[PDB]
Amino acid sequence: AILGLGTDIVEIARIEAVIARSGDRLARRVLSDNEWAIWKTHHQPVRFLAKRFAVKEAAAKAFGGLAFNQFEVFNDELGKPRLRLWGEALKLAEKLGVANMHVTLADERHYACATVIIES
């Protein structure tokens, strides 16, 4: 049974403009500690940040209680993105009865897009 569905689209150059205006505050608000540590040394932090932002926003809508600082994205051994929850995010997931989380991500030269489905 599908418990929730979320999608997002992100214009990358727009993210780059935001970084130009406010420096690292965007990444500080959206990324967990681990993801921030990775972001500090990335070759193309704009693209990384865009992709993470798309995935996490898609997840937030799918849950529709979820804080960007309580759940991080990681790639498993197959290269497929996967969600990791802790704190009140994980508490919410256990409350809703989430058994499986499905994430997909695509990005182009100008846009990143992600979709998340949470299911029991």
Partner: protein, 77 residues
């Protein structure tokens, strides 16, 4: 200035909307045309101006100009 004036000025600046359009009752998304980002830029712009941090989904519920003025007055230190 007042908190109202500074907040309205910042909202207008961030959203690209004329000051006269920024009424206290106006909703950011439904009335001022914020897309999913303008929440981000506006929230962090007000957090910067008034030196306060709001949880994402908490500021998320803030849906109107008056609600932003209210939170700033209630929490600014």
């Amino acid at each position: 200035s007042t908190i109202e004036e500074r907040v309205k000025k910042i909202i207008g600046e961030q959203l690209g909307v004329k000051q006269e359009e920024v009424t206290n009752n106006a909703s950011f998304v439904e009335d001022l045309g914020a897309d999913s980002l303008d929440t981000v830029e506006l929230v962090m712009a007000l957090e910067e101006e008034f030196d306060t941090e709001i949880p994402d989904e908490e500021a998320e519920k803030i849906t109107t100009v008056q609600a932003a003025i209210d939170y700033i007055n209630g929490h600014q230190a």
